[PDB]
Amino acid sequence: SPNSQYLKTRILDIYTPEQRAGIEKSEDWRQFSRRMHTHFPKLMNELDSVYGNNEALLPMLEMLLAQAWQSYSQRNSSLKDIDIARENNPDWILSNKQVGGVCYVDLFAGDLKGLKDKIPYFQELGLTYLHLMPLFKCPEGKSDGGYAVSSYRDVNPALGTIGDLREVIAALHEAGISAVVDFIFNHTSNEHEWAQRCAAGDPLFDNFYYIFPDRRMPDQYDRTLREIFPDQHPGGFSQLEDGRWVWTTFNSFQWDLNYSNPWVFRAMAGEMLFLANLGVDILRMDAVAFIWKQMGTSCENLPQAHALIRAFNAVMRIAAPAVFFKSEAIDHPDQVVQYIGQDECQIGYNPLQMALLWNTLATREVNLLHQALTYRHNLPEHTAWVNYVRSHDDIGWTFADEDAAYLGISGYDHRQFLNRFFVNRFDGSFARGVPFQYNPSTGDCRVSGTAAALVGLAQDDPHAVDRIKLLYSIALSTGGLPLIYLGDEVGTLNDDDWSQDSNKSDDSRWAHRPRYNEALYAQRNNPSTAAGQIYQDLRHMIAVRQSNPRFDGGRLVTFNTNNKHIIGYIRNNALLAFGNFSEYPQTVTAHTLQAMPFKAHDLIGGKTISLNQDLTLQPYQVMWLEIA
Ligand SMILES: OC[C@H]1O[C@@](CO)(O[C@H]2O[C@H](CO)[C@@H](O)[C@H](O)[C@H]2O)[C@@H](O)[C@@H]1O
Ligand SMILES: OC[C@H]1O[C@@](CO)(O[C@H]2O[C@H](CO)[C@@H](O)[C@H](O)[C@H]2O)[C@@H](O)[C@@H]1O
Ligand SMILES: OC[C@H]1O[C@H](O)[C@H](O)[C@@H](O)[C@@H]1O
Ligand SMILES: OC[C@H]1O[C@](O)(CO)[C@@H](O)[C@@H]1O
Ligand SMILES: OC[C@H]1O[C@](O)(CO)[C@@H](O)[C@@H]1O
Known part of the structure; x- marks a missing residue:
């Protein structure tokens, strides 16, 4: 398997010597090169695990990396700022904001x-x-x-x-x-150019889908396939006008990519x-x-x-x-x-x-x-x-x-x-x-x-x-x-x-x-x-x-409410949430609440709740208690 440095040198071979010198000194190339160092081994390992010694793996990978460089080079500078921000803040997705x-x-x-x-x-x-x-x-x-x-x-x-x-x-x-x-x-639609050209025998789109001459393989596959839209067709295949069968997990007009x-x-x-x-x-x-x-x-x-x-x-x-x-x-x-x-x-x-x-x-x-x-x-x-x-x-x-x-x-x-x-x-x-x-x-x-x-x-x-x-x-x-x-x-x-x-x-x-x-x-x-x-x-x-x-x-920790109708859980050891799933009033007992602070502010209704006594929730009431 090739390394990131070897592959980078070949990416640059599309440039004249003068152009290349400029690229290699550029900020975009610096960032791309750094990220290749960090992340290419994963890309290579994952692709190797799937495609192994396939003759097409290395040519495909080089084509892909050349595209990746052109794409990053073209990428708008405002987007490159978001790239950096998230690269250094992986937990942005976890923010309560x-x-x-x-x-x-x-x-x-x-x-x-x-x-x-x-x-x-x-x-x-x-x-x-x-x-x-x-x-x-x-x-x-x-x-x-x-x-x-x-x-x-x-x-x-x-x-x-x-x-x-x-x-x-x-x-x-x-x-x-x-x-x-x-x-x-x-999957694509059956009207996608790739699908039309694949079905029509265009060698450039050979093996872009899963197409079979008859029901022999479809029958074998269908022994173990789940039906997603059984109303539409049985198993995972649909028949073309010419009599062949194509893999269609979903609707007949959605053809699974290969x-x-x-x-x-x-x-x-x-x-x-x-x-x-x-x-x-x-x-x-x-x-x-x-x-x-x-x-x-x-x-x-x-x-x-x-x-x-x-x-x-x-x-x-x-x-x-x-x-x-x-x-x-x-x-x-x-x-x-x-x-x-x-x-x-x-x-x-x-x-x-x-x-x-x-x-x-x-x-x-x-x-x-x-x-x-x-x-x-x-x-x-x-x-x-x-x-x-x-x-x-x-x-x-x-x-x-x-x-x-x-x-x-x-x-x-x-x-x-x-x-x-x-x-x-x-x-x-x-x-x-x-x-x-x-x-x-x-x-x-x-x-x-x-x-x-x-x-x-x-x-x-x-x-x-x-x-x-x-x-x-x-x-x-x-x-x-x-x-x-x-x-x-x-x-x-x-x-x-x-x-x-x-x-x-x-x-x-x-x-x-x-x-x-x-x-x-x-x-x-x-x-x-x-x-x-x-x-x-x-x-x-x-x-x-x-x-x-x-x-x-x-992250959360659940809280045992001792009432089969009331869910309870705690966020950051600081927020105790209760939800009553009954259409009737339901109680969390003072006994159950003994370990909690004496009183707590409820963010939902805005009142201060006494936790040293039985807590009765109205039908479907939610309480969000600040316990720290
Ligand atoms: O500078 C890199 C080194 O690559 C060699 C070829 O072995 O030339 C390649 O790189 C040039 C500049 O990007 C390309 O114009 C050329 O087509 C490519 O073969 C050397 O010529 C060059 O010194
Ligand atoms: O029942 C209303 C309406 O739903 C459509 C398709 O979604 O069928 C659904 O309901 C049928 C009746 O229970 C089910 O047999 C079917 O599996 C379900 O998708 C129509 O067929 C039906 O008129
Ligand atoms: O008849 C109502 C009951 O039907 C089923 O047994 C359900 O498993 C159960 O949750 C429900 O209470
Ligand atoms: O992490 C900060 C995030 O807050 C948003 O405005 C909403 O997703 C993002 O556009 C920005 O990246
Ligand atoms: O952090 C919340 C804490 O702050 C108080 O209001 C005052 O100390 C407590 O009643 C409550 O438990």
């Missing part, structure tokens, strides 16, 4: 210019982080909501131009907001560098689990998938240090956490906490949540969870069966209950969700619907507003970067017309992708409305989180 939001540009603001016009609202809300849903060109009609990408470079013209996107990112940065976008690197071809890694690393130099701060690594395949396995979470992501990480450390990764792994918690590492994905979605928030609202019992917060919350140094309540996707019940079994809970039976409960097929349920991907072969099902729909706001359940507050309080205070599904902060309900659009009617996730509700946002400062009640209470929690250092960092 960070609060994120996510929205669709079209649904929330019409187009990119409209989105730029909403930036003052984002500042008003206190956001420091904004994830914009897939922005680039995609098939007309059905595109999995933009996740079938036809071009990584050309903006969806319904949203505007690449110039509009540049103005948005600059305007976000001006407003103190990180720009977060998707890196959809497991990372066993090192030139595919190179191609996507080039796409990553392009996004980096737009000034993107965080790339959401979509479908991380699926980027390596192996017969006889689930073709999820394989060692090479992790190694490739670590290879991508090294490329950013070399050529765009400001760019961090957010892993999307929605799976068993033992597998979710493996993507999170300073050298892999520095942050990642926390589906366990999210799913168990909803679980706890249904059961009223904090057992599973307490277990998760006790044993699966704390992370390695320089990493963080992204804690959330809802997303653009369905809710999957991804708690661990093994964990549940310790508590005497059958995972299978419990999921059957949660699914009935949240689609209003259980006596007395307050939830108004919609099924998503019921799989008759496994009994698995997921849930669609907005936060407000799932807590009972559609039917004006008097507890709905407080339920929303409780859920978000936990995401905001457990430690990690909280992510608001924009629209939730004014109680936005389902798009009840989603099923009438023939492009959407077989995908119930569209139920919880409503447009910006002008009527609700107009009432956000009106305490007489649900919208204003939700907004003011969420905004207050955001303000407290961001201003109070007791929330800093990602």
Whole structure:
């Protein structure tokens, strides 16, 4: 294997002697050379572990490093300042100052210019982080909501131009907001030029996808593949018009890229560098689990998938240090956490906490949540969870069966209950969700619907507003970067017309992708409305989180409340949080509170609470007590 010094000398061979002397004395080359020294051994090691003695590895690597240098050279000086800042502040992601939001540009603001016009609202809300849903060109009609990408470079013209996107990112940065976008690197649309040219037999795109002559290998693979959208097709493959079969983990119009071809890694690393130099701060690594395949396995979470992501990480450390990764792994918690590492994905979605928030609202019992917060919350140094309540996707019940079994809970039976409960097929349920991907072969099902729909706001359940507050309080205070599904902060309900659009009617996730509700946002400062009640209470929690250092960092210790309905945990040995998941009043006894200070200020309600007597919480009440 080559060394960084050898490879650097060859990078420079493209220059005339006169040009080269100038480059070698330059600040950019000095920084690039330093980062090569520090980070190239990781890049080489990870790529070696995946591709081994492949003839194409060294030529690909040299091509990639040449691109990395050109990319860093071209990179804007303002971005190079963020590179340095984050290179010397790896824990910026862990600051209590960070609060994120996510929205669709079209649904929330019409187009990119409209989105730029909403930036003052984002500042008003206190956001420091904004994830914009897939922005680039995609098939007309059905595109999995933009996740079938036809071009990584050309903006969806319904949203505007690449110039509009540049103005948005600059305007976000001006407003103190990180720009977060998707890196959809497991698959492209079937209309992507790479896909068309690969299928057409263009030798330049040979082996860019997984294409088979018949069902022989697809049948073998399907013995062990999980079905993500069983409504759409069985197993992991779809048939082309010419009779061949292509790997399609997701929709039939999403073709899995073939990372066993090192030139595919190179191609996507080039796409990553392009996004980096737009000034993107965080790339959401979509479908991380699926980027390596192996017969006889689930073709999820394989060692090479992790190694490739670590290879991508090294490329950013070399050529765009400001760019961090957010892993999307929605799976068993033992597998979710493996993507999170300073050298892999520095942050990642926390589906366990999210799913168990909803679980706890249904059961009223904090057992599973307490277990998760006790044993699966704390992370390695320089990493963080992204804690959330809802997303653009369905809710999957991804708690661990093994964990549940310790508590005497059958995972299978419990999921059957949660699914009935949240689609209003259980006596007395307050939830108004919609099924998503019921799989008759496994009994698995997921849930669609907005936060407000799932807590009972559609039917004006008097507890709905407080339920929303409780859920978000936990995401905001457990430690990690909280992510608001924009629209939730004014109680936005389902798009009840989603099923009438023939492009959407077989995908119930569209139920919880409503447009910006002008009527609700107009009432956000009106305490007489649900919208204003939700907004003011969420905004207050955001303000407290961001201003109070007791929330800093990602670590917590749970507190045994001795009440099966009340969750408790402590931040920085200084903030004691209680959340009541019962619709009835619930007490923490004076006996349970004996070790605490005599009195404590509650940041939620603003009163001084006596801890030497029984503490009774109203239904769904949250308390944030300063105990140091
Ligand atoms: O200065 C480096 C050293 O590289 C040698 C070739 O062995 O020339 C290479 O570097 C030049 C300057 O970048 C290139 O113009 C040339 O094409 C490349 O072969 C020497 O010529 C040079 O001294
Ligand atoms: O049920 C409403 C609506 O949802 C769509 C597709 O998302 O199907 C979902 O609901 C069906 C009924 O339970 C499930 O069989 C299916 O798996 C689920 O995705 C439509 O098919 C349906 O009309
Ligand atoms: O009927 C309600 C019960 O159904 C299931 O058994 C669930 O596992 C349990 O949590 C719930 O209380
Ligand atoms: O760490 C400081 C951070 O605060 C922000 O404004 C919000 O993310 C970032 O743009 C900046 O890098
Ligand atoms: O740090 C918080 C501490 O400060 C006080 O208000 C006064 O000492 C205590 O009641 C409280 O425990």
